[PDB]
Amino acid sequence: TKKTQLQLEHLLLDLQMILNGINNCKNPKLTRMLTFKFYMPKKATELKHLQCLEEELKPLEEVLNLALRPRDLISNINVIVLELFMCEYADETATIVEFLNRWITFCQSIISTL
Ligand SMILES: *SCCON[C@@H](C(=O)O)c1c[nH]c2ccccc12
Numbered sequence: 001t002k003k004t005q006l007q008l009e010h011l012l013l014d015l016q017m018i019l020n021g022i023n024n025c026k027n028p029k030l031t032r033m034l035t036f037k038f039y040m041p042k043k044a045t046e047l048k049h050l051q052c053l054e055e056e057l058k059p060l061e062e063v064l065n066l067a068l069r070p071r072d073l074i075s076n077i078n079v080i081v082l083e084l085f086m087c088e089y090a091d092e093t094a095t096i097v098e099f100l101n102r103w104i105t106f107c108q109s110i111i112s113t114l
Contacts, residue, residue, distance in 0.1 A: 001114055004047075005082070005085040012107040014073050019100040021068045029067075036063045038091035044106050051087045053103055054078065063096055 020029065038059065041052035061074045094102070 005111060005114055007080050007084055008092055008111055010105050011077055012104060014077045015100050015107065017105050018073060019066060019097065022097060033063065033067065034095050034097065036096060038096060038099040039089040040094050040099065040102060042088045042090050047110065048085045050081045054081045055087060
């Protein structure tokens, strides 16, 4: 359980650092990046639901590469998810910002239980 918490936390910082680098951009730039839509998960309250994130990693990276990072934090996160059930996506897509916040919440919400 100890190692889990530490992986989740590392996943947490990874996502927050991406969001931090994002929310620090110039507006016009952030504006374009905010045009790209990400698929959100229907449910997401158990570790098993990290499957939705893993599938959205290549896209995330793809949107990011157009713009931290070189390309290590995405791989940091992937490794975590691959180390930490049909994945169903929600109707309406979202912004890279809302995509991070949604998983940051998820991480914090799992850390709250253990
Ligand atoms: S967080 C905003 C920084 O992103 N980079 C933009 C830029 O270099 O001006 C930029 C340009 N094209 C894209 C495409 C997708 C995301 C950001 C982009």
